[PDB]
Symmetry: C4
Subunit: 93 residues, 4 copies
Amino acid sequence: DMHPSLIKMLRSCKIIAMKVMPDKVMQVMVTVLMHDGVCEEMLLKWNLLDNRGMAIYKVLMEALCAKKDVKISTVGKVGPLGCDYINCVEISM
Amino acid sequence: DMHPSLIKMLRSCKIIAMKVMPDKVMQVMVTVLMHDGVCEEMLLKWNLLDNRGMAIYKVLMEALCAKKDVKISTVGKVGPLGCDYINCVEISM
Amino acid sequence: DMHPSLIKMLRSCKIIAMKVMPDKVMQVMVTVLMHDGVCEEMLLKWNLLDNRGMAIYKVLMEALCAKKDVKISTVGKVGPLGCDYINCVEISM
Amino acid sequence: DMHPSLIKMLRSCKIIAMKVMPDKVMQVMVTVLMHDGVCEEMLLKWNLLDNRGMAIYKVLMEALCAKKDVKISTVGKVGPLGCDYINCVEISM
């Protein structure tokens, strides 16, 4: 039982770029920098046309614009476009 | 009749974490710190797939990223996942 | 023909509170402070369930959280809940 | 192969105004200032009622409120309202 104000699969990272391209197969590509120095290009598990994709898209965007560390998890397989898929994001004050 | 610029169920709190997990039963879990020191885990009254859930999700997120105090009210019962449900948020400049 | 970086119905104002209450008849009530000192409570022209209401809801929220002056116009009649309805918002860098 | 934290059709610009007007033919007009000093008024490729239009609308808005440079591409033709249409936005931390 920790301090009320202290928080506490999920890797810590920074969201360093997002390219929104709803004309194309990727739809939106997220560039992520992990805490151990590796940089990875990733997609969202859901279509942007689905509200679940919109919700994941928004927390990632806010994390980039606030310059925040976040934690993410992915489905765990590279797809036919060459990227893993983000399916969970955690953000804290 | 108060100063034009002065504002004025609803408890004052801070939104200290949000975990967006649209694969799972909770969908999104909000960690809230009340002004009297108690910390509580909460859900939204509406599905994320519904625009009302999206609207509550956005004001909470903005409150976390701006480091703002807000006021919330809940439906008033713990559900089968162990959490109350947020149904109203008020935010001020 | 003005400087490329210089911008330029619409009244200038600040968005000083927003109360998101999708359980109730108002859905979301916006408290607005006009530049001449009068303060007014206002609704949105569109349902929150409609994407046009969502779009107006988002620019207002961003204006509150960034502490920005904006310009708004309304439909021009008080409705049966006692408020006018915002139908246009302009925001500038 | 560049530094992990270093990023890298698309023109660099600032988003200096947005006018959200879902009553009218334009729906939302974006004023953009390119790096070479020319200023241009632009629309979105998608309807605001479509989630793809909402996604492009949000990254533009965040870019304005964070005072960020971004890159955009357009469809490449002036339409019957006198404007080109934005179809891709890239934003970086």
